[PDB]
């Protein structure tokens, strides 16, 4: 049994050019589970920005969307480096159980508004 990850904060406000750091919390991270960092697409679907561990075969991967595992074992920083106005949107994270019939659980969605 496992619980879905949590995404913080619910509303993040950053100035254009600064880094915008969310936090995905998930305590099952292991060889059984993987993490995803999503932003909602124009089709109202979750568009995968990044993953933990790094999805190196994702076509068009942008290293500007950075995921870092924190020492406490539960938290993961998910940062937009050098954030632009067009980076404003709705963000979330997911946890995927890899065992056959991989199951996905999403966090609640947070809002990033890039200003100035």
């Amino acid at each position: 049994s496992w619980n879905p990850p949590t995404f913080s904060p619910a509303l993040l406000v950053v100035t254009e050019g600064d880094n915008a750091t969310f936090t995905c919390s998930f305590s099952n991270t292991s060889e059984s589970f993987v993490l995803n960092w999503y932003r909602m697409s124009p089709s109202n679907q979750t568009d995968k920005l990044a993953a933990f561990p790094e999805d190196r075969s994702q076509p068009g991967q942008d290293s500007r969307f950075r995921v870092t595992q924190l020492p406490n074992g539960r938290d993961f920083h998910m940062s937009v480096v050098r954030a632009r106005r067009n980076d404003s949107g709705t963000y979330l994270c997911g946890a995927i159980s890899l065992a056959p019939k991989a199951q996905i659980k999403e966090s609640l969605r947070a809002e990033l508004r890039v200003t100035e």
Epitope: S30, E31, K48, R56, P59, G60, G94, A102, I104
Partner: antibody, heavy 120, light 111 residues
Framework: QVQLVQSGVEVKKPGASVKVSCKAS????????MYWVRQAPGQGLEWMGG????????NFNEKFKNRVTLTTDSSTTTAYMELKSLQFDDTAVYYC?????????????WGQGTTVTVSS | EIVLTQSPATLSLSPGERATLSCRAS??????????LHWYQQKPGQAPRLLIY???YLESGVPARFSGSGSGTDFTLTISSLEPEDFAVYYC?????????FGGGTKVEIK
Amino acid sequence: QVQLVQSGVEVKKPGASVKVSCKASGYTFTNYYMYWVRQAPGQGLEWMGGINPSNGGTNFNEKFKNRVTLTTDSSTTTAYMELKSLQFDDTAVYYCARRDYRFDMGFDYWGQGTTVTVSS
Amino acid sequence: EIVLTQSPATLSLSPGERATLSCRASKGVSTSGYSYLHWYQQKPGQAPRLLIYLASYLESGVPARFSGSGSGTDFTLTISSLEPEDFAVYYCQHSRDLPLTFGGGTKVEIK
């Protein structure tokens, strides 16, 4: 339910170009990245490239970086591979294969293959 | 660039025998407890089929007589009891980094 049906056999001359299609059906077309891998006579399997259908992002094997163009159409759920300046070593069977966008859990479905022959 | 080496090149076996196939990577393909190594089956003239993903997970719909094991640079595919439909070429593939490469294949033949 899940299918990937590729275009038909291609017979080309050196220097020509070929465009192979891959019609996907039975699933959310943007939930899976699409990749292209070929298998030549006397050679093994060779990864050519990949495309993210949601944003059009691509990655490539450096051997094909400047000769392959990958495109997608979500309204028809079709992936396209265009290979220009064909040479003799391009004779092969060309496959499209999908991968879960969430994580790499293998190429869990392959197209049937498209034979492309380069001959004089 | 990671090179995958499959041994043996050919296994001539009868139905009911157990097949074990080796895939050795020139560099490690495991990090954080995940092994980026998949096993496919291809019969000649037909499309490949995913058998094992992440080196130990059985793809849904694939019979349980197939299993994957290993980590780092050493990996094995086991067919616990060979059936007639299992005579085919078997390939490993890594995704630790780009470019993605495949192994040379191991042909499981009937003797």
